[PDB]
């Protein structure tokens, strides 16, 4: 597994990231306390996941750049850009956990739930985002791809926030509206909210770093990676309810939060009129008893087995897309990522 | 007043901004509902202030670019960059109002206090930020200053968020700690949180658009503008308590929120031991009765008259800095801005 291999070097580079970001202090002691707080935010929220989005940048870069051009500086840049993707993710998750009223993340209390943090985490989240652009300037500003990366991170963040807006608008609190939860709407949500930044962004970053900037090259890659991202989000939705929290490191809130999840969309396609009412009376509410009722309806409709069939069909579909669209990139760039996300239970 | 003059054209350009941003829809109908929400967020939060930060870009640009190079496209770019500063401000204020538990802003309920918005405003705020970078790409990407502006907006946002972090760390909820509220700490807070983005950013943006990129040119400007920004924040703090809300369009929360405001710093320098206790028992708490007691202590110490003296001394100081550092820029670029902010009661 090419990810297990790169992973140690990647995670080891984290101190260097933290050191370089916490040395904006040297010229300005007056910001010392803010920098200390940034370090605490980095250590709590950027560490402890699987590093798969960041690691994808490094794996792809080694696979796309001739080994002779992989000098120490080039590699450092690669690990820094991977860390920029991790930082984006940390930004997103800190904010999303507030928005979704989540309890835990990566095996611990959500940052905003800590006594003394609360909605100060909005600022913390946005500091994480800032760090991306400081790292890109500090490590890449003289490279011919610098602007390309900046634009890519900014565009990916815009798209992601557009997705997040569709997510919140499709899920109004205190209102039951099942009629909105369609397959078509679901696919749009997840494409925007998850698939651009989790799949297109890291591979595209590595492409640009390898000098692969062609519009066609990027569009072909994107066809593969947006579909892989739809599957990843569907798996995330399944794991919200049916995943084991000691594996996933987080507690599910989709049913309470009235979310357009793949599960509710699937349920709706299959429910009888009686069951539609059951869903209607119980969905989108805080009461544990009502959440359990929704889960029992999902289990009655064999939605786990529906998920397992879908995962198998999606995996084939994605592999067909790799066959169509990988060239002239090595298929391994996509295959290692597919392997990483399929059968994933965390 | 050169601002009153430019203001109408500036504000008129707002529809065009909204139209160009709400036409990301044409190629992608699936994002239509998100775009509609973006429009509502823009119309609620970017309109209704004084436009002084955005307008500074336009005024300075007309003052720094030879009239012969001020073609229709150049002007459109100038008004768009001004609008980018307004959008940054709107991002900041939407988030800050959540963080500070504010009630009103620009003469209406804060966006997050609207039923149905709540903490979804975190996403709304960040969409406003995204729009900056889309506008810079859509209007300026072929200009030789494009990267300079991008970096300037990103750096200004980082600095601003560093300031905001010092603001929250100096103001812990449920803890009384007056010992932290020193002049030295106050000056650092406000330099970072307010002075970079409210004063340096717009003038610097116009400088770059005029081809003025020299390091020295920017550092001289910055000496003037960071000091003007310290004064503006001190005035903001004074107006938090002593301003008329129908003029300021917002209700003050500094005392409730345990803030390192200029007022509390001034109070502390002047309080007797008895009065220190009064402040200690009453500051940083939600009770109206305790807030009134703090205000009565401030009035007993003649802190309004202290503010009026300070405004006079600061105005002279700033004018001395314009005399030292304006050249070779026209002094009018700084003078119109000073005029705009001194004696300001809103
Ligand atoms: C400005 C900030 C709010 O923008 C964001 C935009 C998107 C996201 C985001 C995108 N994809 C997935 C997540 N989290 C997942 P999760 O299961 O919480 O990890 P989701 O809530 O189920 O969608 C968050 C987080 C933040
Ligand atoms: C990511 C986001 C939270 O970052 C921010 C960073 C800074 C600010 C900010 C900077 N200067 C002034 C304000 N608002 C003023 P206000 O009187 O609320 O308009 P302050 O709360 O008294 O400081 C907000 C707002 C948002
Ligand atoms: Mg979530
Ligand atoms: Mg969410
Ligand atoms: Mg989820
Ligand atoms: Mg405030
Ligand atoms: Mg504030
Ligand atoms: Mg204030």
Swiss-Prot record, chains A, B:
Positions annotated to bind Mg(2+) 2: 96, 100
UniProtKB keywords: Acetylation, Cholesterol biosynthesis, Cholesterol metabolism, Cytoplasm, Disease variant, Host-virus interaction, Hydroxylation, Isoprene biosynthesis, Lipid biosynthesis, Lipid metabolism, Magnesium, Metal-binding, Steroid biosynthesis, Steroid metabolism, Sterol biosynthesis, Sterol metabolism, Transferase
The protein's enzyme class: transferase
Cell location: Cytoplasm
Signal peptide: none
Main location: cytoplasm
Cofactor: how bound: Binds 2 Mg(2+) ions per subunit.
Catalytic activity as recorded in UniProt: isopentenyl diphosphate + dimethylallyl diphosphate = (2E)-geranyl diphosphate + diphosphate; isopentenyl diphosphate + (2E)-geranyl diphosphate = (2E,6E)-farnesyl diphosphate + diphosphate
EC number: 2.5.1.10, 2.5.1.1
A GO MF term: RNA binding
Binding annotation for Mg(2+) 1: 96, 100
Segments forming a coiled coil: none
Assembly notes: Homodimer. Interacts with RSAD2.
Family: Belongs to the FPP/GGPP synthase family.
Protein known as: Farnesyl pyrophosphate synthase
Species whose genome carries this gene: Homo sapiens
Residue span relative to the full protein: 74 to 419 of 419
